[PDB]
mmCIF file with all atom_site columns, C-alpha atoms and ligand atoms in Angstrom:
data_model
loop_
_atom_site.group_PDB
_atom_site.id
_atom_site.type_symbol
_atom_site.label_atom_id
_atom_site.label_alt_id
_atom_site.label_comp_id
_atom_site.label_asym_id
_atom_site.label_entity_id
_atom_site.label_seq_id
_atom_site.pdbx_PDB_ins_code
_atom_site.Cartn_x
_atom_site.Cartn_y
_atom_site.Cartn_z
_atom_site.occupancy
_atom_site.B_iso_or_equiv
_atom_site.pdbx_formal_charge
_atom_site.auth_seq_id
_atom_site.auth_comp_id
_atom_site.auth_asym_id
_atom_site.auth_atom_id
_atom_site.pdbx_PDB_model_num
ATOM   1   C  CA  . UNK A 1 1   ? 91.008  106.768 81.487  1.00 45.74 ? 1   UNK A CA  1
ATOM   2   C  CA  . UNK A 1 2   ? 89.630  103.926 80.462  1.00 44.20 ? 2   UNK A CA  1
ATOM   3   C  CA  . UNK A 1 3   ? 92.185  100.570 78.948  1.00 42.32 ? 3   UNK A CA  1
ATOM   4   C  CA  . UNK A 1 4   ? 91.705  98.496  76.329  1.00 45.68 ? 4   UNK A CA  1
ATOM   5   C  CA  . UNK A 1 5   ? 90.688  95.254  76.052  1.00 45.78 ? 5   UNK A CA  1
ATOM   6   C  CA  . UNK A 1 6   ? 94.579  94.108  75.158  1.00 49.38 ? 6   UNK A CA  1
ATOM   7   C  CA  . UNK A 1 7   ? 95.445  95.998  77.898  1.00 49.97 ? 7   UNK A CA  1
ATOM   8   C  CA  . UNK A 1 8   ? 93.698  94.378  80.495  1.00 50.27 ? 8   UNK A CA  1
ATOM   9   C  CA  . UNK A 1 9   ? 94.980  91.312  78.971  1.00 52.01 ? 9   UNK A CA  1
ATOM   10  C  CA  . UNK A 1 10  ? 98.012  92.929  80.325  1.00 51.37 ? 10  UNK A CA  1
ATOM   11  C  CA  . UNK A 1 11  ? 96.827  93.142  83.368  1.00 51.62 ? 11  UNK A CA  1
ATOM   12  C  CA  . UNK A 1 12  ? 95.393  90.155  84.055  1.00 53.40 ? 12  UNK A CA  1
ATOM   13  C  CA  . UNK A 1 13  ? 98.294  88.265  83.118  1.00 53.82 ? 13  UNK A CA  1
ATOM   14  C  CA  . UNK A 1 14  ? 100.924 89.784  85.681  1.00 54.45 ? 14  UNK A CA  1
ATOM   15  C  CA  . UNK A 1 15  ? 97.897  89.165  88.245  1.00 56.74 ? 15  UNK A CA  1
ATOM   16  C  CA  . UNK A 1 16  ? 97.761  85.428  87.472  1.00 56.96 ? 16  UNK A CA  1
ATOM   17  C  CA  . UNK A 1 17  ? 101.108 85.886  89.089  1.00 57.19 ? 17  UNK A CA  1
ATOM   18  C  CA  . UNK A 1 18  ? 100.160 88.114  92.188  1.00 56.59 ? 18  UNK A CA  1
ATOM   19  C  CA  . UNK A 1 19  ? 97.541  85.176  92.311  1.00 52.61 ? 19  UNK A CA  1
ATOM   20  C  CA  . UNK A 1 20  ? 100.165 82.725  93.848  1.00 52.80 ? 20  UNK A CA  1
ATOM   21  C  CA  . UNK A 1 21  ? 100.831 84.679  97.436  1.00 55.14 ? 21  UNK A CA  1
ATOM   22  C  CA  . UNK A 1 22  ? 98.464  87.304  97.715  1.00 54.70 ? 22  UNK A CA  1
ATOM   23  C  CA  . UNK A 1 23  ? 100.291 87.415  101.288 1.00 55.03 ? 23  UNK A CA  1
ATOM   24  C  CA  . UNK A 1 24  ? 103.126 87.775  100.792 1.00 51.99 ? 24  UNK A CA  1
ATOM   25  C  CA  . UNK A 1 25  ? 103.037 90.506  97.372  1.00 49.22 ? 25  UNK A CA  1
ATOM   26  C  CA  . UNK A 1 26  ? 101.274 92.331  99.822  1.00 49.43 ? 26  UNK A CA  1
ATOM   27  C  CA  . UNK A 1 27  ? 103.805 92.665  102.227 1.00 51.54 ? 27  UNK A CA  1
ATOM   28  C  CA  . UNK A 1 28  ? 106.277 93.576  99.712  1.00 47.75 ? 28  UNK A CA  1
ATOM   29  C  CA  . UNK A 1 29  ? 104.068 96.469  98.901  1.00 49.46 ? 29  UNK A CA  1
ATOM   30  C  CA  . UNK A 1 30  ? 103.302 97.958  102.029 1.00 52.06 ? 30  UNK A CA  1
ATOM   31  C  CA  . UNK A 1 31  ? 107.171 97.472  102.349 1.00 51.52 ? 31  UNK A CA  1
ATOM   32  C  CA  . UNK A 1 32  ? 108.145 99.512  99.497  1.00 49.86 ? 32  UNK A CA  1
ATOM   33  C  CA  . UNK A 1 33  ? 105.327 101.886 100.799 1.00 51.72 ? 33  UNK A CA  1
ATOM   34  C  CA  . UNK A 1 34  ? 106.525 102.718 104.297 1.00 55.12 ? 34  UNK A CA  1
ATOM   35  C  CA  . UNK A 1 35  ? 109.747 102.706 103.504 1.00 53.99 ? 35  UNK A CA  1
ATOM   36  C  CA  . UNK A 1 36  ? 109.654 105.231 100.371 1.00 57.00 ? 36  UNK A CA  1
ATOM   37  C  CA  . UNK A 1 37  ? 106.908 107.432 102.081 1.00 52.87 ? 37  UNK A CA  1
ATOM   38  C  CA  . UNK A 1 38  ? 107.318 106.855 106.457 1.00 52.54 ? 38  UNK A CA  1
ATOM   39  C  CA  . UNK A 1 39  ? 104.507 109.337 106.949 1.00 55.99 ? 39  UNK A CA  1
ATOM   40  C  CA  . UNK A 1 40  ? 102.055 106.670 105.552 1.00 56.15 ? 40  UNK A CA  1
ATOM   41  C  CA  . UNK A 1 41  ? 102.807 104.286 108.511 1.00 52.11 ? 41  UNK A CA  1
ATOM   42  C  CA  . UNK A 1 42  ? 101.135 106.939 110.979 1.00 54.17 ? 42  UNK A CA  1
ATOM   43  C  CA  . UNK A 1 43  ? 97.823  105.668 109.331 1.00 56.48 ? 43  UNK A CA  1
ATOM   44  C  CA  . UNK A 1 44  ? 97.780  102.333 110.515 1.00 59.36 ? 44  UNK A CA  1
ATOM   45  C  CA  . UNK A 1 45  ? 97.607  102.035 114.399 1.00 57.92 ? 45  UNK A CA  1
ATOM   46  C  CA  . UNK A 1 46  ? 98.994  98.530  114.439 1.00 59.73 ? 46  UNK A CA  1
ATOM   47  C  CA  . UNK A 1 47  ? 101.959 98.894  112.356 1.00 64.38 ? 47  UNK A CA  1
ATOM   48  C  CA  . UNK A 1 48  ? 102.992 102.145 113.407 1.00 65.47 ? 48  UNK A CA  1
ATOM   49  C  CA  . UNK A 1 49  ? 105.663 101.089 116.330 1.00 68.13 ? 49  UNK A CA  1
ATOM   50  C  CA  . UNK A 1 50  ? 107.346 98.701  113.106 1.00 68.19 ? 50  UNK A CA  1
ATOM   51  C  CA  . UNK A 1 51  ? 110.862 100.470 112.554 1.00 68.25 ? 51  UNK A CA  1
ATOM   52  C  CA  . UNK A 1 52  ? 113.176 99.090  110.115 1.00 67.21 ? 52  UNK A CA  1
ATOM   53  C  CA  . UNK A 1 53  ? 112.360 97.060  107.436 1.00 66.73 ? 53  UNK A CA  1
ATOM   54  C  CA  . UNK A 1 54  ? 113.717 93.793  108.737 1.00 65.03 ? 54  UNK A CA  1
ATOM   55  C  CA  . UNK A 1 55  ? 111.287 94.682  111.931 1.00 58.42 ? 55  UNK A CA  1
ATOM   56  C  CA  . UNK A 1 56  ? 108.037 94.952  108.986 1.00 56.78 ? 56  UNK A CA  1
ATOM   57  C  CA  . UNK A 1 57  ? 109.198 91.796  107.849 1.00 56.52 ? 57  UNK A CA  1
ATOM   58  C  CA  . UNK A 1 58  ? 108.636 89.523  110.554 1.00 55.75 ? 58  UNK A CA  1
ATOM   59  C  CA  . UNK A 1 59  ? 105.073 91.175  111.529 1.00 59.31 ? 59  UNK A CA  1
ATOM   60  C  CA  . UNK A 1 60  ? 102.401 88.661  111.128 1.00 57.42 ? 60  UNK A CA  1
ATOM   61  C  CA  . UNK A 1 61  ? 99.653  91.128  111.143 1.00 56.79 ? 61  UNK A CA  1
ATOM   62  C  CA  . UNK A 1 62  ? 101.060 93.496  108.347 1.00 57.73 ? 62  UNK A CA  1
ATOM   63  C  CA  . UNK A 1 63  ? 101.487 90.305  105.842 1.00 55.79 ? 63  UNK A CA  1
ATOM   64  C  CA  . UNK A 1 64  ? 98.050  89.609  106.390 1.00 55.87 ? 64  UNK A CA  1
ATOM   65  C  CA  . UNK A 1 65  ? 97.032  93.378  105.765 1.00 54.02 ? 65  UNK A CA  1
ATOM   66  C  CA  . UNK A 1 66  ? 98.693  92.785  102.909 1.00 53.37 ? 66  UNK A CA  1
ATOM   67  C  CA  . UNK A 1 67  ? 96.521  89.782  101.916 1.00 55.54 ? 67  UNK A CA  1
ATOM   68  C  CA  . UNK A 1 68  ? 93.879  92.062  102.856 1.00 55.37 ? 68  UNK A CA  1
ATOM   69  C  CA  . UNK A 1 69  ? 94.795  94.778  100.551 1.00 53.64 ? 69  UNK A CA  1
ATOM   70  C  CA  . UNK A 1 70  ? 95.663  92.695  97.516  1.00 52.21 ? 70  UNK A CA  1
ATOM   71  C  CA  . UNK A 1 71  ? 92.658  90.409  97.577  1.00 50.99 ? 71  UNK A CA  1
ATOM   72  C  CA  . UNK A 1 72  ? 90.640  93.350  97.089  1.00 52.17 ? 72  UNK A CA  1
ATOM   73  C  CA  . UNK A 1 73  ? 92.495  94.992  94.576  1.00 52.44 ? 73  UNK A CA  1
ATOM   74  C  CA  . UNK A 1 74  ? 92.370  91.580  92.659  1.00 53.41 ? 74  UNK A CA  1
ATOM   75  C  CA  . UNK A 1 75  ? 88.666  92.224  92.437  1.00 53.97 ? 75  UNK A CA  1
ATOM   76  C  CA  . UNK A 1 76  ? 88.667  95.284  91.745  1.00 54.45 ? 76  UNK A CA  1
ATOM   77  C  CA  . UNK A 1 77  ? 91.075  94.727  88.735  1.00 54.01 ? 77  UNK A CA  1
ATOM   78  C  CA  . UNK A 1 78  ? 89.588  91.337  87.546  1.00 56.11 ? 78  UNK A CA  1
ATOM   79  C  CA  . UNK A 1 79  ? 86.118  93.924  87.161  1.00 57.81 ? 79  UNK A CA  1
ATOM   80  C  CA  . UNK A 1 80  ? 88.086  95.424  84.165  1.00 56.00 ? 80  UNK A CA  1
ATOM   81  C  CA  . UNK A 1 81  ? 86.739  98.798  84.896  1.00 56.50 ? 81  UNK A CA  1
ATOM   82  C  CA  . UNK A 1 82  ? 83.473  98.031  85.993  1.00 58.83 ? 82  UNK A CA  1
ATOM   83  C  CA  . UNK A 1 83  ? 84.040  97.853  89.528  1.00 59.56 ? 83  UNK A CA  1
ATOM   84  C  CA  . UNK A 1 84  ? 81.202  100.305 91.233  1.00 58.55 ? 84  UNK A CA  1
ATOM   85  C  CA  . UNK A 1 85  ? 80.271  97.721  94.056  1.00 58.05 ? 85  UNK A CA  1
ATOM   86  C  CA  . UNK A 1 86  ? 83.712  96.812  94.928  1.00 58.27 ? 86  UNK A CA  1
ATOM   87  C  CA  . UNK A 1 87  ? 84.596  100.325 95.606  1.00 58.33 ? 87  UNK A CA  1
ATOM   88  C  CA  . UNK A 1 88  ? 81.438  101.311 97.532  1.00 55.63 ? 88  UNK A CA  1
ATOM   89  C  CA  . UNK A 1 89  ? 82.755  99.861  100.733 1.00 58.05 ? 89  UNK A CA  1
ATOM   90  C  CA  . UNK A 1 90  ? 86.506  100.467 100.318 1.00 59.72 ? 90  UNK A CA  1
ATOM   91  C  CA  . UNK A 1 91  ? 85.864  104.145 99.622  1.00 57.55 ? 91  UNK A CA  1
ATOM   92  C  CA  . UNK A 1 92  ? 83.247  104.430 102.706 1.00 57.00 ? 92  UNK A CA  1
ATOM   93  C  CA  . UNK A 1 93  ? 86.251  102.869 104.870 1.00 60.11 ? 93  UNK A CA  1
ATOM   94  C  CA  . UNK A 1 94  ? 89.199  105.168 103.519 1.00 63.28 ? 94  UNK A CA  1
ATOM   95  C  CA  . UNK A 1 95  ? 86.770  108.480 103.138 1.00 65.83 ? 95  UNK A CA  1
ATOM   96  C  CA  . UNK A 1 96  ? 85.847  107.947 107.087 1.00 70.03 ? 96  UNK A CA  1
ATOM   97  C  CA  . UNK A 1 97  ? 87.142  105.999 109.884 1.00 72.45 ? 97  UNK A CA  1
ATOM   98  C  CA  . UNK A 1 98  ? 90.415  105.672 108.021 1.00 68.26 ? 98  UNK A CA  1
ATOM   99  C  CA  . UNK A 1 99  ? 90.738  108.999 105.973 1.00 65.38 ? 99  UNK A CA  1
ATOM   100 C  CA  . UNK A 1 100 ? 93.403  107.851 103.066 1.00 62.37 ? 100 UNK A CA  1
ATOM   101 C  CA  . UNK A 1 101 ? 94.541  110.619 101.057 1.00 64.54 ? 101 UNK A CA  1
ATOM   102 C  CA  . UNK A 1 102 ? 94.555  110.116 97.298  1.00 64.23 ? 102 UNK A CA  1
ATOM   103 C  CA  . UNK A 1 103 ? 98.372  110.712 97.195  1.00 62.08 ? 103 UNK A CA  1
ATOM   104 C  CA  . UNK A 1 104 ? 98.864  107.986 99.351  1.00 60.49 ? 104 UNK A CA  1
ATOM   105 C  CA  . UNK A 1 105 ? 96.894  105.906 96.950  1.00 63.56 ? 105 UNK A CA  1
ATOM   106 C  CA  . UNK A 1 106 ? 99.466  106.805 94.097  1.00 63.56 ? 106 UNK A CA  1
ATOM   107 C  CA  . UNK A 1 107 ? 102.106 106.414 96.648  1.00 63.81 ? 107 UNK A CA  1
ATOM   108 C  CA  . UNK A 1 108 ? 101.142 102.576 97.055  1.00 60.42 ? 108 UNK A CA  1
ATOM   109 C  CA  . UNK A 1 109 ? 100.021 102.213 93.517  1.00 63.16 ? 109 UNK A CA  1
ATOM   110 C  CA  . UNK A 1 110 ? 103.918 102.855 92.488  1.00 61.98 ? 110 UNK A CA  1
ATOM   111 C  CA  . UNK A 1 111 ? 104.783 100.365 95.370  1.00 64.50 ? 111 UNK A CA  1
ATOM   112 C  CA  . UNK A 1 112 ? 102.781 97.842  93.539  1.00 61.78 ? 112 UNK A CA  1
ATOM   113 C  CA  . UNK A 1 113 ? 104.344 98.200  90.130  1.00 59.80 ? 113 UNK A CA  1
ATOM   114 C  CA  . UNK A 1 114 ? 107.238 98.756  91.323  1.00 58.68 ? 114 UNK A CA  1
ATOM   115 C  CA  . UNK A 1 115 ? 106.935 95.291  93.213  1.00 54.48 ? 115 UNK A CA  1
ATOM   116 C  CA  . UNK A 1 116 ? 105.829 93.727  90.177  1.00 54.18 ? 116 UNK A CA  1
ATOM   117 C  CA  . UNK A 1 117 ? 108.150 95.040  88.406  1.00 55.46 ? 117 UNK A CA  1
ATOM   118 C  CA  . UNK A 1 118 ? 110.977 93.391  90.455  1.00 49.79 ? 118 UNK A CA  1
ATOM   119 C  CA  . UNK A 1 119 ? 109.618 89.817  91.030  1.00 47.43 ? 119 UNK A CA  1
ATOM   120 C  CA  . UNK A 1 120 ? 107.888 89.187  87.066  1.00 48.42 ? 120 UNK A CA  1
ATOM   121 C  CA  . UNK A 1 121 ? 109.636 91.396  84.748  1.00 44.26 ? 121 UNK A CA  1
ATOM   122 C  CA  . UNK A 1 122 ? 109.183 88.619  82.002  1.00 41.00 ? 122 UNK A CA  1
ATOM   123 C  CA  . UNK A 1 123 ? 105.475 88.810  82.406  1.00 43.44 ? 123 UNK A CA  1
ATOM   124 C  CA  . UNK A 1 124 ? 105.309 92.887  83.450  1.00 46.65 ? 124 UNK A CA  1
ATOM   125 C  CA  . UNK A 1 125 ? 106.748 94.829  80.016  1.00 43.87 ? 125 UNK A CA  1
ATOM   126 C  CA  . UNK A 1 126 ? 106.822 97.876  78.793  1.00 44.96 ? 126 UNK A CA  1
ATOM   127 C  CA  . UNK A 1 127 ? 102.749 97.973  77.586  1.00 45.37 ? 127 UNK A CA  1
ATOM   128 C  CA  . UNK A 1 128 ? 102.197 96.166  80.601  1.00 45.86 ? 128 UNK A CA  1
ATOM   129 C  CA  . UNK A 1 129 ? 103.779 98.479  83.144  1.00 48.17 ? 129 UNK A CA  1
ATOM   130 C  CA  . UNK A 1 130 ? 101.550 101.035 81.575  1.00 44.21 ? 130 UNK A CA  1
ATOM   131 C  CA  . UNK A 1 131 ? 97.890  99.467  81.440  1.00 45.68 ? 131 UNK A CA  1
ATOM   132 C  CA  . UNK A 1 132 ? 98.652  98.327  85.035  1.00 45.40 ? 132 UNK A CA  1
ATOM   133 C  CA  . UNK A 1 133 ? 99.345  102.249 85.909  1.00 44.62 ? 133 UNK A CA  1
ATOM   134 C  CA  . UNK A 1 134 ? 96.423  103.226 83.943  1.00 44.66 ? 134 UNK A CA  1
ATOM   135 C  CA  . UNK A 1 135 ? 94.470  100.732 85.895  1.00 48.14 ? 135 UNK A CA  1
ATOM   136 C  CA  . UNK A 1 136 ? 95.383  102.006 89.395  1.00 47.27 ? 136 UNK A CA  1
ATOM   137 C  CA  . UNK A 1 137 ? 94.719  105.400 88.070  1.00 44.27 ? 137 UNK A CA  1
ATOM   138 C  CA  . UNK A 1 138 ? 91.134  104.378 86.832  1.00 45.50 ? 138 UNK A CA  1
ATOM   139 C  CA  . UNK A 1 139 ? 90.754  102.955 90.474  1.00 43.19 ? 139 UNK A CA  1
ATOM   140 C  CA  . UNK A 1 140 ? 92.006  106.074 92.463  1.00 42.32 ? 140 UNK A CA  1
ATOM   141 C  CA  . UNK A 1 141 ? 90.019  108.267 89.859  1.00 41.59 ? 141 UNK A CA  1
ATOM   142 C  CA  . UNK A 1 142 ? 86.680  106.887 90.644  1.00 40.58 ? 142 UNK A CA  1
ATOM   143 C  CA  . UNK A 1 143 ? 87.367  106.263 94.375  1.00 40.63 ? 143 UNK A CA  1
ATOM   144 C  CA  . UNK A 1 144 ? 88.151  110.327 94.459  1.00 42.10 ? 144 UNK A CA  1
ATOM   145 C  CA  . UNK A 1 145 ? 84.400  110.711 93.470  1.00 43.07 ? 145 UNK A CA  1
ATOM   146 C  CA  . UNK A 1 146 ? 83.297  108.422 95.911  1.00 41.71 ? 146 UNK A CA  1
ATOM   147 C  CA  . UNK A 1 147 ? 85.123  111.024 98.210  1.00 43.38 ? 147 UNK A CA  1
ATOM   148 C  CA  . UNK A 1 148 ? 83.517  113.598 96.706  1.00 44.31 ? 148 UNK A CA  1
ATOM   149 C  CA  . UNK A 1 149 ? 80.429  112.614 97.845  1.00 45.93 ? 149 UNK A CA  1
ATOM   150 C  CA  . UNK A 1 150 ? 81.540  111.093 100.820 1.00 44.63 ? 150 UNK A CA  1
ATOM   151 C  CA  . UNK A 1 151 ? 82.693  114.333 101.792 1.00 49.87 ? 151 UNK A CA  1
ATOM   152 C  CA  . UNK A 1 152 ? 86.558  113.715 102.158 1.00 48.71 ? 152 UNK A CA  1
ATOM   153 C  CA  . UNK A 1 153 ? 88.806  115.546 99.944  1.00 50.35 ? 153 UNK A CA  1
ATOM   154 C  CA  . UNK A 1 154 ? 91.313  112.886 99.524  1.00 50.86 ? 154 UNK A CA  1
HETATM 155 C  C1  . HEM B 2 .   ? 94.971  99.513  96.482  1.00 52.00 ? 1   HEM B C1  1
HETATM 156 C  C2  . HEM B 2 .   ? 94.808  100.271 97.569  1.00 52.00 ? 1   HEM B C2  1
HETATM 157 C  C3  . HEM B 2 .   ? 94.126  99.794  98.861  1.00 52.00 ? 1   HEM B C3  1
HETATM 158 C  C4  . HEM B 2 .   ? 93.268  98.791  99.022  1.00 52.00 ? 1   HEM B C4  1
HETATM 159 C  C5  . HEM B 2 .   ? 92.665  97.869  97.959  1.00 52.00 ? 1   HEM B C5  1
HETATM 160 C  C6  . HEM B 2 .   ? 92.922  98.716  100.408 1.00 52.00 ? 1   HEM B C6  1
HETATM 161 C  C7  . HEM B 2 .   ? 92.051  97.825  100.927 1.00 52.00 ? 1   HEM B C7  1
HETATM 162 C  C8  . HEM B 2 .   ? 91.732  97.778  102.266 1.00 52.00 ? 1   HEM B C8  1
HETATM 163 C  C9  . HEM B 2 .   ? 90.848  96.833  102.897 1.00 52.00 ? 1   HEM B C9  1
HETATM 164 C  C10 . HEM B 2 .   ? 90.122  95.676  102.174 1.00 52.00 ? 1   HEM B C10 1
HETATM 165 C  C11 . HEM B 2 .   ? 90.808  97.121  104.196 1.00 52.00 ? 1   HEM B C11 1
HETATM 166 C  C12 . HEM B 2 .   ? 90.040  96.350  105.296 1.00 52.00 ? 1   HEM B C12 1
HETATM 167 C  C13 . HEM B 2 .   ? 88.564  96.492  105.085 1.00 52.00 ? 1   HEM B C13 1
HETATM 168 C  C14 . HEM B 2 .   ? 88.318  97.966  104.896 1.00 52.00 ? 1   HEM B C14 1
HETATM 169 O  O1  . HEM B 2 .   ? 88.946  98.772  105.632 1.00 52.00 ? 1   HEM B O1  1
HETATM 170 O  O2  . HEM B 2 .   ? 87.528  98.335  103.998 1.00 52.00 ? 1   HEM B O2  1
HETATM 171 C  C15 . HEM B 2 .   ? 91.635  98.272  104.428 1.00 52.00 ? 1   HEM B C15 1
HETATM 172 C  C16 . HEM B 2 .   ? 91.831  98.861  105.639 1.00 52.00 ? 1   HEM B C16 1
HETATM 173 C  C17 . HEM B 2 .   ? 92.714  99.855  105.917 1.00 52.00 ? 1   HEM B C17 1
HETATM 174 N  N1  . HEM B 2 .   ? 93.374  100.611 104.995 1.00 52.00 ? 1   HEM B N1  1
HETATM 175 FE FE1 . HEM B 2 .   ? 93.389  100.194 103.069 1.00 52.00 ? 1   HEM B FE1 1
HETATM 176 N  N2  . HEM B 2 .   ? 93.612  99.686  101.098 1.00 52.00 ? 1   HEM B N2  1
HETATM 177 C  C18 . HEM B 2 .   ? 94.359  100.396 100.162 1.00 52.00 ? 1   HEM B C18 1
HETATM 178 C  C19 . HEM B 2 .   ? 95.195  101.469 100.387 1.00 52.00 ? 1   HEM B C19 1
HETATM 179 C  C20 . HEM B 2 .   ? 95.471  102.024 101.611 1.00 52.00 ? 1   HEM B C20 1
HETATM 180 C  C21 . HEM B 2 .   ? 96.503  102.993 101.886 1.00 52.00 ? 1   HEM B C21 1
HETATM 181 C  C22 . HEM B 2 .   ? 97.454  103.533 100.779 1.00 52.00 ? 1   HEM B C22 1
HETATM 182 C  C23 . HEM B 2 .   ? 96.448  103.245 103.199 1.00 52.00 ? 1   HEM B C23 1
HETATM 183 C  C24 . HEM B 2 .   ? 97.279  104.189 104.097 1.00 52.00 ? 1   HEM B C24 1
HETATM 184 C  C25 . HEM B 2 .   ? 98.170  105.075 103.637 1.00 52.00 ? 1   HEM B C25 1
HETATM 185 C  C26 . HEM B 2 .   ? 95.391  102.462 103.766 1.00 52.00 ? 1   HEM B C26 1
HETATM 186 C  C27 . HEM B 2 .   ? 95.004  102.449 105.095 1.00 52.00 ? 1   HEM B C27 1
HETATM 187 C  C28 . HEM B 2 .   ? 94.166  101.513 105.679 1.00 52.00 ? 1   HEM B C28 1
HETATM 188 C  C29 . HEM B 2 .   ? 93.983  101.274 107.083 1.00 52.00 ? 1   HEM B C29 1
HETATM 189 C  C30 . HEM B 2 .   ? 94.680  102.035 108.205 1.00 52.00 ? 1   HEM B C30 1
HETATM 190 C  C31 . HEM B 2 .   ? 93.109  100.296 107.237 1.00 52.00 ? 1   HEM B C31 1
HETATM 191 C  C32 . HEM B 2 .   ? 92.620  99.695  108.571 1.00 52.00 ? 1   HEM B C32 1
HETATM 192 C  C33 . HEM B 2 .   ? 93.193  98.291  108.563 1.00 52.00 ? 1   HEM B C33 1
HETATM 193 C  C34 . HEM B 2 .   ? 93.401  97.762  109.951 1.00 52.00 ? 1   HEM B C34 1
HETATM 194 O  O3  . HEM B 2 .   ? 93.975  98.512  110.794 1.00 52.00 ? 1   HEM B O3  1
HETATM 195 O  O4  . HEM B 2 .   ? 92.996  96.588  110.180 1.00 52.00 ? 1   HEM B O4  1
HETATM 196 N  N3  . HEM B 2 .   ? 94.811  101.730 102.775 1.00 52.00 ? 1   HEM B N3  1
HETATM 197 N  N4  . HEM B 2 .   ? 92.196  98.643  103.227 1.00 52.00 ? 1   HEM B N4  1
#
C-alpha cells in the first residue's frame, strides 16, 4: 500500500504542476468523470441538469468544485501517507450527507491520471503514473475504513 520515498518524489513533482490552476485541472477531471461514468453526475444536485460537455465547460460553479476537490487532494497527497486529519472530514461528508461510493472514487482517481497524463506527460512517466495510482489507492483504502466505521459501505 504504502510508496516510497522516490515515489512520492514522483508525486509531488507532477503536483507542482496541478499547483498552477487548481481550477481549472479540476474541471478537467470532473470532465473526464461525468463523461466516462454519467451516473456519477446524479450525485451532485447542482451539476446534474449540465448535458454535454461543452455545457460542463462553461459552468462556473463546477470549475470551482473542481478547485474544491483538488485543493484537498493536494493536502492530502503533500501528507505523503500520513494524512488521518485530512480525511476525517472528507470521509464524514462522502460517508453521510453525500454517500460517495468507493467505485466512484476509482472512477475519478483514473480521471485524474488520466488528466495528468494528457496535459504533463514529460513530468508524469511510467514510475510516475504508478506511485500516483498507488497514491489514490492509499487514499480510497483508508477513506473505506473511515466508512467502515462511519457506517457506509462505500
Ligand atoms: C479525490 C476525491 C474527492 C475529493 C478530494 C473530494 C473533496 C470534496 C470536498 C472538499 C468537498 C466540499 C467539502 C466537503 O464536502 O467535505 C466535496 C463535496 C462533495 N463531493 Fe467530493 N471529493 C472527491 C470525490 C467525489 C466524488 C467522486 C463524488 C461523486 C461521485 C463526490 C461528490 C461530492 C458532492 C456531491 C459534494 C457536495 C459538493 C456541493 O454540492 O457543493 N466527491 N468533495
Amino acid at each position: 500500500m504504502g510508496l516510497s520515498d522516490g515515489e512520492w518524489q514522483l508525486v509531488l513533482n507532477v503536483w507542482g504542476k496541478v499547483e498552477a490552476d487548481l481550477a481549472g485541472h479540476g474541471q478537467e477531471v470532473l470532465i473526464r468523470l461525468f463523461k466516462g461514468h454519467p451516473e456519477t453526475l446524479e450525485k451532485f444536485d447542482k451539476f446534474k441538469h449540465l448535458k454535454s460537455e461543452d455545457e460542463m465547460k462553461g459552468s462556473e460553479d463546477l470549475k470551482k468544485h473542481g478547485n474544491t476537490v483538488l485543493t484537498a487532494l493536494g493536502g492530502i497527497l503533500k501528507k505523503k501517507g500520513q494524512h488521518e486529519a485530512e480525511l476525517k472530514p472528507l470521509a464524514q461528508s462522502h460517508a453521510t450527507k453525500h454517500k460517495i461510493p468507493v467505485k466512484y472514487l476509482e472512477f475519478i482517481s483514473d480521471a485524474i491520471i488520466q488528466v495528468l497524463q494528457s496535459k504533463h506527460p514529460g513530468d508524469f512517466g511510467a514510475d510516475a503514473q504508478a506511485a500516483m495510482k498507488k497514491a489514490l489507492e492509499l487514499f480510497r483504502n483508508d477513506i473505506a475504513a473511515k466508512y467502515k466505521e462511519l457506517g457506509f459501505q462505500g
